[PDB]
Design a protein around this ligand. Structure first.
Ligand code: ADP
Ligand code: ADP
Ligand code: MG
Ligand code: MG
Lengths: 419, 213, 206
């Protein structure tokens, strides 16, 4: 009846559903084709069919309603919307549209939208009056996103260390710097679990670029939110498309006074896709990266801000360093001081089998007075006073044993004042 | 009526202003487009429209009146000035021009300047006789810009230390050397507050390059 | 069959000559219409002629007119084409009063050498050009009009000052794109606009 649940159902249920409807030879076809075949057979029955998706306005004028299940990939089951709907209902890219759809008539291969009754989880009339994201005035982060989980076991202290290293708030534009094989993949998993548990209201989005297929499955099964990704086999034009879709969708949610958190991975890989797709403008910098090529990722990364009117957009990205590629290090140079939060991971700490491998001295956040209270903020200052003299390799080891014997970070603070 | 106050007004007031004038679908557009749409609808009414901006002469010959609200960024609401105005009124880049503007005729997308009645906050005739900046003879600083504020609390002593460390005067060309995360961002804030408070007459300009939003 | 539907659809007198009729009949019909049209013009009356087709008409004149000893390419005599040019060139706007408008269709790419040479003589003889593209027609997109090639001469008098310049900016954005997709661009844009006036303001929006 509704396209939303058909994609969520496994392929096995779809095969059984299609067989009783009279369809045949469905197991050997793709999942997208099965959905189209099932809808087509149900469409001619006469019962109304609903749908949902994310609008993607093309340069021609007509758009499509991509689905987050397929990672916003074009497919036969995508809903086609004529430019007339964009006229009557003023819509932009990334808008969420849910409504009745009509069967495709001969001469067209895509379903068409009949009527719109829900735009961005709101009435269509109210969505027309929402202020644009650009017109919103950015501000510093005010409310802190707690990272410590009470149910979290003492085996993994990554969540607790992040609170001591660099607190994160709504609208933060933090950047993660880490060499390869430094544990950055599961570092975001701890952040995703903490955000989902401590702040269920916040919308969590995980974006993966050039990630292995196995990595995508575990992220979807672990993160309590919609996760989109693009495998390495997909062309470069697909990687940029996924990134553009997520940021546009995130901006629309911000306009509705809603908080959305994006865990980008990785900014270095994302800039590679933009460099390839964007044609050369005649100016080539070191490493073969065009100056105009890096303009797009900066605008995407810089969109993170705290809106004074309401809502916030928090973007956390991982930067790859010491990867052996000249093109990778030059990108990190452009994104050096562009973030208000720095989280540096050390390779030499990681090889010592001590986790989390966080360089406490280098990592930090800017304007942390607003995030933390008066007492909590000054308790971190004295902690940094005793961690700075010691080496970074043993600095993490010092915190690991101290945090192990303390149930919570509050107990750790009073212990430090004891000596 | 005047472009100067339209930019200062928030976006919410602009939406309400446009709706009663008959405009529709303004919330989803940029602020610059809203100003252009509001001016266009008001232009056809018949009432005169004023404007203000900073001249930016291009290499072709024609200039534009950029606005400080948009950080001198090119936009649809920028006022276009033909080279004829630069001829009759000898103007250079950075000049402040305020005067009546005309609605854009078809085939052009920018407003045009009708007449000039204020150049650099002065009569246009007097502005033509001003001596060029290069011809002026430089000199050492004479009058000191006081940095200590009486209303300043004892919590922040940055203003007082600057007086003891290195006094600053009019025409000074000081340079600040500081490593990253050394408190230089709010160091200028204390200077800006002291200059604005102690010397309200002085024109204060803050320029930021590659700064976070 | 084509004749019957034209008579039943056109709100005016329609004359035609079937293919079975001899060549001497085709010229007779053409001469009768132009002579009748000229007389109406003399009475300060406006007459519009939709000729179809000028290529076929020249074939009839070539057959009936005896050879004068000079044969051009394709077997068309120079004096043979003199008559259709005078018939086609009779269209004009009379200063005293009335007008005579003649619109004719020229056949090209018909596979006949005689057809293409006739079009060469009638290339720059008209003040209005309306070229249709075969490749647009096979795409099942109509009308299959080559916007870039089609045009009119001295259009300032026909249109107003505002309307004329609104077409210039339209041609400024249609020229860069290909002719095959140029018509497709106009079809969708005109579909969402009730009238051409609404189409003009939409273009200025972007
Ligand atoms: N908090 C942690 N606790 C235990 N092991 C960790 C932790 N973080 C990383 N690791 C180790 O790192 C390895 C995975 O690293 P990975 O996340 O793939 O790095 P990268 O993403 O840079 O390739 C695992 O084998 C795991 O043992
Ligand atoms: N006069 C001051 N009083 C108190 N704190 C200060 C002062 N100047 C700088 N700071 C500290 O510096 C931090 C901000 O540094 P910042 O100006 O961002 O340095 P940079 O501009 O080099 O990055 C704040 O957290 C603040 O606590
Ligand atoms: Mg990884
Ligand atoms: Mg700074």
């Amino acid at each position: 009846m509704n396209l939303t649940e058909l994609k969520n159902t496994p392929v096995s249920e779809l095969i059984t559903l299609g067989e009783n409807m009279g369809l045949e030879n469905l197991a050997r076809m793709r999942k997208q084709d099965i959905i189209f075949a099932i809808l087509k057979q149900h469409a001619k029955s006469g019962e109304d069919i609903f749908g949902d998706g994310v609008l993607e306005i093309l340069q021609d004028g007509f758009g499509f309603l991509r689905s987050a299940d397929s990672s916003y990939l074009a497919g036969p089951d995508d809903i086609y919307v004529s430019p007339s709907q964009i006229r009557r209902f003023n819509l932009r890219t990334g808008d969420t549209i849910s409504g009745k759809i009509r069967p495709p008539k001969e001469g067209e291969r895509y379903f068409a939208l009949l009527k719109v009754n829900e735009v961005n989880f709101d009435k269509p009339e109210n969505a027309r009056n929402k202020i644009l994201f650009e017109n919103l005035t950015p501000l510093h982060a005010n409310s802190r996103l707690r990272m410590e989980r009470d149910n979290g076991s003492t085996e993994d202290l990554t969540a607790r260390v992040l609170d001591l290293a660099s607190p994160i708030g709504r609208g933060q534009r933090g950047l993660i710097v880490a060499p390869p094989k430094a544990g950055k993949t599961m570092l975001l998993q701890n952040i995703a679990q903490s955000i989902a548990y401590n702040h269920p209201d916040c919308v969590l989005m995980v974006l993966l670029i050039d990630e292995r297929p196995e990595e995508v499955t575990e992220m979807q099964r672990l993160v309590k939110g919609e996760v989109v990704a693009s495998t390495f086999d997909e062309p470069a034009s697909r990687h940029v498309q996924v990134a553009e879709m997520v940021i546009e969708k995130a901006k629309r949610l911000v306009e509705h006074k809603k908080d959305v958190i994006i865990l980008l991975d990785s900014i270095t890989r994302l800039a590679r896709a933009y460099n390839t797709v964007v044609p050369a403008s005649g100016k080539v910098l070191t490493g073969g990266v065009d100056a105009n090529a890096l303009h797009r990722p900066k605008r995407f990364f810089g969109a993170a801000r705290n809106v004074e009117e309401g809502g916030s957009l928090t973007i956390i990205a991982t930067a790859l360093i010491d990867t052996g590629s000249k093109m990778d290090e030059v990108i990190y140079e452009e994104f050096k001081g562009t973030g208000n939060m720095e989280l540096h991971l050390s390779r030499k700490i990681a090889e010592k089998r001590v986790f989390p491998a966080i360089d406490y001295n280098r990592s930090g956040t800017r304007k942390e007075e607003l995030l933390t209270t008066q007492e909590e903020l000054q308790k971190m200052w004295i902690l940094r006073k005793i961690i700075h003299p010691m080496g970074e390799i043993d600095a993490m080891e010092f915190l690991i044993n101290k945090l192990a014997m303390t149930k919570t970070n509050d107990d750790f603070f009073e212990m430090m004042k004891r000596s």
